């Protein structure tokens, strides 16, 4: 190779493959020894002056250096990395804010040990989109809406490549099936001294929704004791308040609620928790 003062090269190989590592432009009948991480190898894996590796695994990656026989004079260096070809990515778009834009996440099912390159292209019919990204994460560009009730479906495609292969995937959807708000926060329960079988339950709206007045939501309330394991399902109308009348006398409870728009979207995840027992007269 080049001068021994150089940095080692980067060479990627497959898992279970076979590859030979020569000592640069040296001859075949030259005295050459190899060392991995400072440990010398056995002469059984040397085909003259080259290094022959059979059955590459995850433990064969590292710094392979070429030295003179029984010496510390460096000749050639190379960094070997073992990885797998990429698989079909898992693309999923979600509209956390219906009046505003949406976002799309993607990830590989089987992890790879080498860096990857991703490129996403979003189409609204025959037009082009930019999807300027502003997240704290990556692998998202947050496509922003421009028209409403356009009846035209969106097309998103993400392509991934590697030093050993490449792959791509694409999905299609509308502007209504990807709508899913965030669960409400600070769901607190309070006792009621006025009634024996009562519990004050009040929640809020998700902070991500910028325009809730023009697009109301429907809440699904679930209240259940801690020992019966029999959950109850009660769907509510417009409002962030409820009143239960058939709860326990003294035992604890867990109440969780979700959110969903009036005509579009899907049901959201449940809230964190709730714990309160009704008042006891003594």
């Amino acid at each position, epitope marked *: *190779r*080049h*001068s*021994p003062q150089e940095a080692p090269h980067v060479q990627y190989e497959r898992l279970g493959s076979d590859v030979t590592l*020569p000592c*640069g*432009t*040296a*001859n*075949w*009948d*030259a*005295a050459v020894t190899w060392r991995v991480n400072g440990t010398d190898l056995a002469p059984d894996l040397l085909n003259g002056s080259q290094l022959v590796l059979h059955g590459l695994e995850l433990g064969h990656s590292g710094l392979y250096a070429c030295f*003179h026989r029984d010496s510390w*004079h460096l000749r050639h260096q190379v960094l070997l990395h073992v990885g797998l070809p990429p698989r079909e990515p898992v693309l999923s778009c979600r509209s956390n804010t219906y009046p505003k834009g949406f976002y799309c996440s993607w990830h590989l099912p089987t992890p790879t040990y080498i860096p990857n390159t991703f490129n996403v292209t979003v189409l609204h019919g025959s037009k082009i989109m930019v999807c300027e990204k502003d997240p704290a994460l990556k692998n998202r560009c947050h496509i922003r809406y421009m028209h409403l009730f356009s009846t035209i479906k969106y097309k998103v495609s993400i392509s991934v490549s590697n030093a050993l292969g490449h792959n791509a995937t694409a999905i299609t959807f509308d502007e209504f099936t990807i709508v899913k708000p965030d669960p409400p926060e600070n769901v607190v329960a309070r006792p009621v001294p006025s009634n024996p079988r009562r519990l004050e339950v009040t929640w809020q709206t998700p902070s991500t929704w910028p325009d809730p007045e023009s697009f109301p939501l429907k809440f699904f309330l679930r209240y259940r004791p801690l020992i019966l394991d029999q959950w109850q399902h009660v769907e509510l109308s417009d409002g962030t308040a409820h009143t239960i009348t058939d709860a326990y006398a003294g035992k604890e409870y867990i109440i969780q609620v979700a959110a969903k728009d009036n005509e579009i979207g899907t049901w959201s995840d449940w809230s964190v928790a709730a714990h309160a027992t009704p008042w006891t007269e003594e």
Partner: antibody
Amino acid sequence: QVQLVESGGDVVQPGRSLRLSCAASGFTFSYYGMHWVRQPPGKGLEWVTIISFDGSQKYYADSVKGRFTISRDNSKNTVFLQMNSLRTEDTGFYYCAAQSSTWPEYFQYWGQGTLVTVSS
Amino acid sequence: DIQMTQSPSSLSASVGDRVTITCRASQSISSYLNWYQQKPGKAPKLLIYAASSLQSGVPSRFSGSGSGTDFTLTISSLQPEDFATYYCQQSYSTPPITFGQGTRLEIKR
């Protein structure tokens, strides 16, 4: 007993391409790497290219990069050098040499060389 | 990358004298230097490899010393069959292999 002969050199205009031939003998041609050093009239030596003993690594100089191509056949022990887009400044004696197997590496064997005159 | 500088470019001396040739490099090379001898009308011939090791069949009058950045090619007693051009070649960075500008020896009168 090691002999190195060259062929394929005479006057050629800068508009045509040439190809050199280097036949090795007296040693194991498949175990040694072949070099190419040229020398213009009235000047010093100048390395051109280098090919591996098997034929996997090929390196060229920036002065002839993109125009020259080196190849070799270990069966017939012949070295080829496809010289394309010749010019007058490429005039000089080309030498066929082989590197050494010891450390450090050096030029052990040499040939008589051939003349390549390039003028319109 | 590495540029070789010889000194001087031409030297005139009589037979039996001590001639010293210097070859300077552009960076620090341990011992990767080779000395060649090229006569007018013939191919160059290696004299000393590794700048200190004489090749088989070379008279003992030739010698070589120096390392790191400066080297030295010295001849004990000059002979009539020693007047030729000498080059120094580095074997540290490949590619490219760089040679010196040459040092031609002449007869003194």
